[PDB]
């Protein structure tokens, strides 16, 4: 189990860690989160009591270093930092536990939700989408735009998701105009799986990262990216059977975890109705289809 200490909590803020979150009052003695399960990526995120715009946060993996949070009153936000002095870090963490000023990552032992949401997410791939190689953790917020969005302005702050475009040079073979547009098995398997992602786990990883960014920050271009990668699979007639079964699990926990009051902006009617009911793969998403009908029969 690992720890992320906080120097202080000078401004009222709602702190999230993965799918959990806590309300912290202005200058309440708060000094970190403990018992964070080692072995997965994690996201610690913030929404100030005063500005319910701009959700922001940091992707990190505790194995890659000792990380902590500290409020910056010039830039006005909680920043993640790395402590390289391992001794000085065990010391702060111990003294803060001793004083019991830390919340415990509140995992139920029965609950695999976070594992299911993050099965294929790797810190190494995150740092290629969020390029900032001087830090081992990755910052994301509500307002960041994606590379594809920018193409249609500051690239340093860009989500370098893999660009997917059904009416592109990349999407269609010369002479297979109709075949490939109706049956994207070529965009999916040859150009994306074997070409760019190399395997389905990296593909699934970016898909899962995109969803989490849309859920935790309402990042609109991540939502676009998540739907695009769902649609590419669902619109391919030929998909490895292992991918289909894992996709149904992936989508199931994502739908299960979504706050009910957000389905309106987070779920694209067209893609889902096409995936669940019109696509080649209508029959391959039994669990995702059952939970969608019993929870959001409206959108359908």
């Amino acid at each position: 189990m690992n720890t992320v200490p906080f120097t202080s909590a000078p401004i009222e803020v709602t702190i999230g860690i993965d799918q959990y979150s806590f309300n912290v009052k202005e200058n309440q003695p708060f000094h970190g989160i403990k018992d964070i399960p080692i072995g997965h990526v994690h996201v610690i995120h913030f929404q100030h009591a005063d500005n319910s715009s701009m959700r922001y946060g940091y992707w990190f993996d505790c194995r890659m270093g000792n990380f902590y949070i500290q409020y910056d009153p010039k830039d006005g936000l909680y920043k993640m930092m790395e402590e390289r002095d391992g001794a000085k870090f065990e010391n702060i963490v111990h003294n803060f536990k001793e004083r019991q000023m830390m919340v415990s990552y509140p995992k139920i032992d029965e609950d695999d939700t976070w594992y299911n949401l993050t099965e294929f997410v790797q810190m190494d791939k995150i740092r290629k989408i969020v390029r900032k190689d001087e830090n081992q953790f990755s910052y994301v917020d509500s307002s960041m735009t994606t590379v594809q969005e920018n193409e249609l302005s500051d690239p340093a702050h860009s989500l370098n998701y893999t660009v997917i475009n059904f009416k592109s040079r990349e999407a269609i073979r010369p002479g297979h105009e109709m075949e490939d547009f109706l049956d994207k098995s070529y965009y999916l398997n040859t150009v994306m799986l074997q070409g760019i992602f190399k395997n389905s786990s990296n593909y699934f990883g970016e898909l899962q990262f995109a969803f989490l960014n849309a859920m935790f920050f309402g990042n609109y271009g991540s939502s676009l990216q998540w739907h695009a990668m769902i649609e590419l699979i669902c619109s391919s007639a030929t998909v490895p059977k292992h991918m289909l079964d894992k996709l149904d699990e992936i989508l199931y926990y994502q739908i299960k975890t979504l706050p009910e009051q957000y389905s309106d902006i987070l779920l694209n009617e067209r893609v889902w109705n096409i995936c669940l009911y019109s696509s080649f793969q209508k029959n391959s998403l039994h669990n995702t289809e059952k939970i969608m009908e019993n929870k959001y029969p409206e959108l359908l």
Partner: protein, 237 residues
């Protein structure tokens, strides 16, 4: 964006553009089989591609052989249309390639947009107008060349005959759409009106009769009266 009543006059500026109408590409008769089941038989069709400014028509004849052994023909028809429009643009010199292609039916957007992927500076546009270009097979010389074809064939016509010697493109397109509107609403009457006077003939190299300016006015009035009447009959007004 979409072409509509407001941006209508853009058709007659000097940006090259083509209308594409796919309505007559896949044409069937529907009959009964020995066992009493219904079956279709395809007849020859055409892509109707027209430059509204110059009257040049690129009538691409779709021979029934192109459907042989193919499923989901109505969907395939839209892709074949795009495939042939694509090839037509790619056959033309650069300075004759259109800057826009306006499709009379929105289902053509995606097929044309994919066949034209590599042609990113040609804009594919839908339209809100109710253009009567389906009636093109009511023009005898066009229906004739389509039904006689024995192989895929491109036949070129000027759909305005020689009108532009004397009237504007705007006026020429308005005459064309009025004539086709009438032929669509009541072909038999429309055709009666055009041929009634045996002394007005159609030149071998023309599609329509050699009316004088005055006789076109009478004709156009008669085609307007036809159209209004049929509407009252349709709706009881």
């Amino acid at each position: 964006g979409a072409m509509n009543s407001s941006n209508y006059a853009e058709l007659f500026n000097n940006d090259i553009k083509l209308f594409v109408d796919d309505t007559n590409v896949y044409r069937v008769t529907v009959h009964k089989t020995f066992e009493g089941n219904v079956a279709t038989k395809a007849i020859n069709g055409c892509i109707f591609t027209l430059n509204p400014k110059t009257g040049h028509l690129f009538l691409k004849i779709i021979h029934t052989s192109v459907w042989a052994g193919q499923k989901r023909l109505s969907q395939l028809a839209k892709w074949k249309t795009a495939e042939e429009v694509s090839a037509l643009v790619r056959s033309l010199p650069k300075e004759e390639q259109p800057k826009q292609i306006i499709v009379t039916r929105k289902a053509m957007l995606d097929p044309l947009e994919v066949h034209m992927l590599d042609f990113p500076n040609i804009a594919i546009r839908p339209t809100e107008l109710r253009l009567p270009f389906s009636a093109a097979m009511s023009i005898d010389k066009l229906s004739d060349v389509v039904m006689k074809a024995t192989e895929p064939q491109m036949v070129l016509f000027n759909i305005y005959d020689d009108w532009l010697d004397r009237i504007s493109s705007y006026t020429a397109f308005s005459r064309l759409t009025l004539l086709l509107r009438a032929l669509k609403t009541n072909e038999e009457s429309a055709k009666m009106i055009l041929l009634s006077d045996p002394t007005i003939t159609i030149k071998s190299y023309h599609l329509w009769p050699s009316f004088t300016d005055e006789q076109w006015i009478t004709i156009e009035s008669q085609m307007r009266d036809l159209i209004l009447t049929e509407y009252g009959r349709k709706y009881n007004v």
